[PDB]
Amino acid sequence: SSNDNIELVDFQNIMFYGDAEVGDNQQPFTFILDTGSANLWVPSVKCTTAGCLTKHLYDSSKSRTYEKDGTKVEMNYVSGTVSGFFSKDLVTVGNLSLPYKFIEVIDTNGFEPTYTASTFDGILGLGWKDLSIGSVDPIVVELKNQNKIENALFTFYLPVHDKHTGFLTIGGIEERFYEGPLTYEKLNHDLYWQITLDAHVGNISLEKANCIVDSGTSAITVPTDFLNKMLQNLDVIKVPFLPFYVTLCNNSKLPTFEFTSENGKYTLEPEYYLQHIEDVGPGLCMLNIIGLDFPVPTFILGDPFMRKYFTVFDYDNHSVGIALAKKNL
Numbered sequence: 001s002s003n004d005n006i007e008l009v010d011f012q013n014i015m016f017y018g019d020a021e022v023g024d025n026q027q028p029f030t031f032i033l034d035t036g037s038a039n040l041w042v043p044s045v046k047c048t049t050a051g052c053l054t055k056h057l058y059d060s061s062k063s064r065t066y067e068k069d070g071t072k073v074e075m076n077y078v079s080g081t082v083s084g085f086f087s088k089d090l091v092t093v094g095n096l097s098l099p100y101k102f103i104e105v106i107d108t109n110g111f112e113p114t115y116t117a118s119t120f121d122g123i124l125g126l127g128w129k130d131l132s133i134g135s136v137d138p139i140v141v142e143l144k145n146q147n148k149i150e151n152a153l154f155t156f157y158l159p160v161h162d163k164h165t166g167f168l169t170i171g172g173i174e175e176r177f178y179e180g181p182l183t184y185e186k187l188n189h190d191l192y193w194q195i196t197l198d199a200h201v202g203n204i205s206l207e208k209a210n211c212i213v214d215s216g217t218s219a220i221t222v223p224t225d226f227l228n229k230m231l232q233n234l235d236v237i238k239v240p241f242l243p244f245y246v247t248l249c250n251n252s253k254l255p256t257f258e259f260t261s262e263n264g265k266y267t268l269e270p271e272y273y274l275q276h277i278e279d280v281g282p283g284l285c286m287l288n289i290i291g292l293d294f295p296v297p298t299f300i301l302g303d304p305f306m307r308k309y310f311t312v313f314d315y316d317n318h319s320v321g322i323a324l325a326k327k328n329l
């Protein structure tokens with residue numbers, strides 16, 4: 001392989017992980033690879049909460065290439081807060097290495113229970129510079145600037161549960177990962193990997209909707225107005241009193257998403273947004289679709305989309321490449 005590949009492992013068909021190294025001695029970490037954020041978050045040995053004790057921790061004291069930064073990072077949420085500081089050190093992705101400014105995480109006081117139960121260590125962003133904290137050039141951008149890769153692009157071939165493993169490839173596109181035509185959609189903004197597509201479900205239509213391609217989202221996000229109209233008489237029921245949608249797995253009235261442009265047509269069948277829940281009932285499935293409303297009519301194409309479609313992320317050409325992922329390698 002003339003390109004840099006990192007193997008992707010599936011986690012119960014809801015999320016996937018990838019491993020990368022931090023430090024001179026190449027300390028290994030399990031990462032969530034996220035195109036919806038743009039920073040590298042690594043837990044520190046200076047993190048002493050219960051959850052952190054069970055994680056792989058970055059010890060800057062055991063790395064020759066560690067360069068002190070110290071710039072405080074405190075990201076606040078309700079639920080909770082993520083505290084830390086910036087650090088610079090050698091980041092190894094596959095067989096490539098470069099000095100990189102990342103965030104050393106000291107405190108995760110909100111997410112302590114879920115983090116513990118989680119099987120990942122940190123988060124590796126794959127968005128754009130303007131999406132990052134502290135104006136940090138994306139790893140792939142930085143790598144090409146350093147003449148370490150052919151092209152400023154990375155590609156996602158996601159793993160399928162119980163079927164096959166996946167790969168993150170940096171620097172080049174490999175034909176083995178996809179079938180059918182490979183079509184490009186130019187970004188409408190250099191922030192998220194967001195493109196402009198027309199969405200169609202049955203006769204329900206929405207045109208020139210902002211579509212964000214995001215590997216950090218387990219579901220498919222749809223405008224609430226769009227969701228209610230598409231689930232009209234399809235033998236699909238809302239849970240009381242929550243926004244959960246349940247249906248029979250064999251529901252023949254289940255529609256297919258259709259995202260079209262001037263260059264390509266992208267469809268997502270029921271087999272891609274249905275999650276089996278045989279616990280509650282025989283032949284019962286849940287719709288992995290969330291009704292979410294942004295100021296602009298926006299779809300979020302999370303894992304269920306990328307699970308079907310091999311994707312290309314081009315910084316140089318400011319575009320997203322989309323093609324039918326091969327079902328077997």
Ligand SMILES: Nc1nc2cc(-c3ccccc3)ccc2c(=O)n1C[C@H]1CC[C@@H](c2ccccc2)O1
Nearest residue numbers: 034035036037041075082123212214215216217300
């Ligand atoms: N992919 C992703 N990654 C995140 C990572 C973080 C995060 C939190 C702590 C440390 C590092 C990253 C927070 C939120 C998101 C988060 O919301 N997303 C989802 C993407 C899809 C849409 C976009 C977005 C845009 C506006 C409002 C809410 C969400 O973010």
